[PDB]
């Protein structure tokens, strides 16, 4: 009884404090600067050989090698410079949802509808690849397990729970709770101390690895959240939702700054990404296209076309030289 | 270049292995099994598996029972299966609207607009006993039952009451009304009557898959 009244009073106080510190807007300050114009990109390489749709991808740390995962139970490693296959690993379970690449290039991980994110070893004396460890402590399906170091990994599953693992012993150490719907994505800070997540209850949270407590919460959307990415500076991020919108949040103010919305667009967004200098924004849509937005002006500039089915992954190299996309027709392309 | 020609050799070998793998992959049919509790789904047969073979043809069947009750996110994976098997219990009148609602929700999806459905009406023996003895009515739950007549296409079993036939065909028409209302000609529905001790259940799936493939092929030559 009194709990709901106290919650309402606290929410009113928080909203008053948050709205009491807004003087101007971002669009009112960057009016004087000139726009970027028009940018056109042409595909350079096309990679073929997969049997079914592609669900995930990841770039290497040297921006030459990349890995891909397919629904037929395969995990191939490519050489983007010369389009040469280096490895081909068969999976025990056909349903796979994610993949990762270690920073040092010695391990590869994957997981899916089997509630397990496995670890593979790439440099062995016998000359082949083999499973090094298996982790099983989750209930629902697994949507993202992302490396943090050579000895620890961060995983988010579909039972509204995130955890921090220990590869050496296989036992989890820290558990994060607080969401209501299942978690769909996460991103890591450049210093590897903080990370964010987006669930299916239209909210996002900022966690602390060392302690294990929530810091602050941002809510400005209206539907489920499908993707999230971090600003190169380390003090902002962008999210993609199911109502065809993107928003930019500021950590130091706990308010949204701009909305990237346009008419005659009625499809959701599956993935977002930034650039090396943080001046452009790329987003993949369900209408078989890809758009490039202007971060400081929120107006479209350039389109990427050529796919014949919905896109499902998107990434940018560490040195900022190429973009790679994968779709549901099992073709990978590199733009420049 | 002596160390870069061997890389091309290795890549060609890997590609030739994938070529062998494709032929094995392409010659197998997958099936998805759905339903609810108290339906005898397990009697007919976070991931299960079951492989059976008929006339030197391989079939794969999956069952999902390790997740929560929210199925609007992991159901997009099964968008390229051959067919979907739906199991209902046609002997309890208190839980028919739920089955109808899930059937409608599955049928009217956007990523599953080219997938056919094979429908099993399980537990056909308890319904006859319930109607013959007599302790509950049907017009109390469905008011439309008071103006139903058996269609001329009926094929009653030898030596059975016509009331049971009317009850069976009303329940079948309830699903057929939804099935034949939003079809553009890309997928259909195959009704069936199933008992708890029947022995011929793989042949029905065999024939239904054959019919699905034949219709799909005939459609695109402007012959259908």
């Amino acid at each position, epitope marked *: 009884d009194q709990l709901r009244q106290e919650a309402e009073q606290l929410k009113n106080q928080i909203r008053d404090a948050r709205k009491a510190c807004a003087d101007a807007t971002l669009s009112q300050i960057t009016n004087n600067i000139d726009p970027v114009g028009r940018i056109q990109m042409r595909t350079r390489r096309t990679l073929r050989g997969h049997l079914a749709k592609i669900y995930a991808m990841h770039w290497g740390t040297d921006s030459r090698l990349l890995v891909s995962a397919s629904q037929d139970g395969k995990l191939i490693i490519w050489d983007s410079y010369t389009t040469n296959k*280096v490895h081909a690993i068969p999976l025990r379970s056909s349903w796979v949802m994610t993949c990762a690449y270690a920073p040092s290039g010695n391990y590869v991980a994957c997981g899916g509808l089997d509630n397990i994110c496995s670890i593979y070893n790439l440099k062995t004396r016998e000359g082949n690849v083999r499973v090094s460890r298996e982790l099983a402590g989750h209930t629902g399906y697994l949507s993202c397990c992302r490396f943090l170091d050579d000895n620890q990994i961060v995983t988010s599953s579909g039972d509204t729970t995130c955890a921090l693992w220990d590869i050496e012993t296989g036992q989890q150490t820290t558990t994060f709770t607080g969401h209501t719907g299942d978690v769909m994505s996460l991103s890591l800070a450049p210093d590897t101390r903080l990370f964010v997540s987006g669930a299916c209850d239209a909210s996002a949270k900022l966690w602390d690895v060392r302690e294990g407590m929530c810091r602050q919460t941002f809510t400005g959307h209206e539907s489920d959240i499908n993707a999230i990415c971090f600003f190169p500076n380390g003090n902002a991020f962008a999210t993609g939702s199911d109502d065809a919108t993107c928003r930019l949040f500021d950590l130091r103010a706990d308010q949204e700054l701009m909305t990237y919305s346009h008419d005659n667009i009625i499809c959701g967004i599956t993935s977002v990404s930034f650039s090396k200098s943080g001046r452009l924004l790329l987003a993949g849509y369900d209408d078989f296209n890809c758009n490039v937005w202007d971060a400081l002006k929120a107006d479209r500039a350039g389109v990427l076309a050529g796919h014949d089915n919905r896109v499902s992954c998107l990434g940018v190299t560490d040195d900022g030289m190429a973009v790679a996309t994968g779709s549901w027709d099992s073709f990978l392309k590199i733009w420049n | 270049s002596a160390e870069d020609k061997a890389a091309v*050799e290795r890549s060609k070998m890997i590609e030739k292995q994938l070529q062998k793998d494709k032929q094995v992959y392409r010659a197998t049919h997958r099936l998805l099994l759905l339903g609810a509790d108290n339906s005898g789904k397990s009697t007919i047969v976070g991931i299960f598996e079951t492989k059976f073979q008929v006339d030197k043809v391989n079939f794969h069947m999956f069952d999902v029972g390790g997740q929560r009750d929210e199925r609007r996110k992991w159901i997009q994976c099964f968008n390229d299966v051959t067919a979907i098997i739906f199991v209902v219990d046609s002997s309890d009148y208190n839980r028919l609207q739920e089955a109808l609602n899930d059937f409608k929700s599955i049928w009217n999806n956007r990523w599953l607009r080219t997938i056919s459905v094979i429908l099993f009406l399980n537990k056909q023996d308890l319904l006859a006993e319930k109607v013959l003895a007599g302790k509950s009515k049907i017009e109390d739950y469905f008011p439309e039952f008071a103006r139903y007549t058996t269609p001329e296409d009926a094929t009653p079993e030898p030596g059975e009451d016509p009331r049971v036939t009317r009850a069976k065909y009303f329940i079948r028409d309830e699903f057929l009304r939804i099935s034949t209302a939003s079809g553009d000609g890309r997928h259909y529905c195959y009704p069936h009557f199933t008992c708890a001790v029947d022995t011929e259940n793989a042949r029905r799936i065999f024939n239904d898959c054959r019919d699905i493939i034949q219709r799909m092929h005939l459609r695109q030559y402007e012959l259908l």
Partner: single-chain antibody, 230 residues
């Protein structure tokens, strides 16, 4: 990992034999194989090479026309068939493995040896070396006769060490990065024609003969070797 070979003996001129290299401990179906011979008074010499899947075979030019190489994957065996031999074939043969892909490390494991008693880029080493007391600095240089940069930033030059009474071991590949299992006290660098080897700390278990090898054109040429005394 283990490689065992059998054969050899005493052969009168005009005869024939057969040598077998048996492998056990690794995937035999993904590696190429090499045969290397060592004269009793000279350095190493290349003989033959068979690829993976038997899709490419090469020979040097002092044997071609009377030697044959073959493999059999299911039984994990390597064969060498010889036609009538001359008096210059008195040498001990070795069995080597190598795998080629981006970032690999060829020429890593060697064989044991076999006695078969019967009776072009030029790389030059010279001057041997005087005995060295432990705790000093030693430098070894190998001179080539052609550029070894293949227009893509890769320089091909390998270094090997043969302890007395044992088999050669790999130290450095591509003249830049060190191999696995070797202490990090070895460094190597050089220009496109001149090369050198640097060792900082001298111990009592680093005595032997060092060789410089090149892998740019498939007729492979070794060096002459430098002996370190104590």
């Amino acid at each position: 990992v283990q490689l065992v070979e059998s054969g050899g003996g005493l052969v009168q001129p005009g005869g024939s034999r057969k040598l077998s290299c048996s492998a056990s401990g690794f995937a035999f179906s993904s590696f190429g194989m090499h045969w290397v011979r060592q004269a009793p008074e000279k350095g190493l010499e290349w003989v033959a090479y068979i690829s993976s899947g038997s899709g490419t075979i090469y020979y040097a030019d002092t044997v071609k026309g009377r030697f044959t190489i073959s493999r059999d994957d299911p039984k994990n065996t390597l064969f060498l068939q010889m036609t009538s031999l001359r008096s210059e074939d008195t040498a001990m043969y070795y069995c080597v493995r190598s795998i080629y892909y981006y970032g690999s490390s060829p020429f890593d494991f060697w064989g044991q040896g076999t006695t078969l008693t019967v009776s072009d880029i030029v790389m030059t080493q010279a001057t041997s070396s005087v005995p060295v007391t432990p705790g000093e600095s030693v430098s070894i240089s190998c001179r080539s006769s052609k550029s070894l940069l293949h227009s893509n930033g890769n320089t091909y030059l390998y270094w090997f060490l043969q302890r007395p009474g044992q088999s050669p071991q790999l130290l450095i590949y591509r003249m830049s990065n060190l191999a696995s299992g070797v202490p990090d006290r070895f460094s190597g660098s050089g220009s496109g024609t001149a090369f050198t080897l640097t060792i900082s700390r001298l111990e009592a278990e680093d005595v032997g003969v060092y060789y410089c090898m090149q892998h740019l054109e498939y007729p492979l040429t070794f060096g002459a070797g430098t002996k370190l005394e104590l």
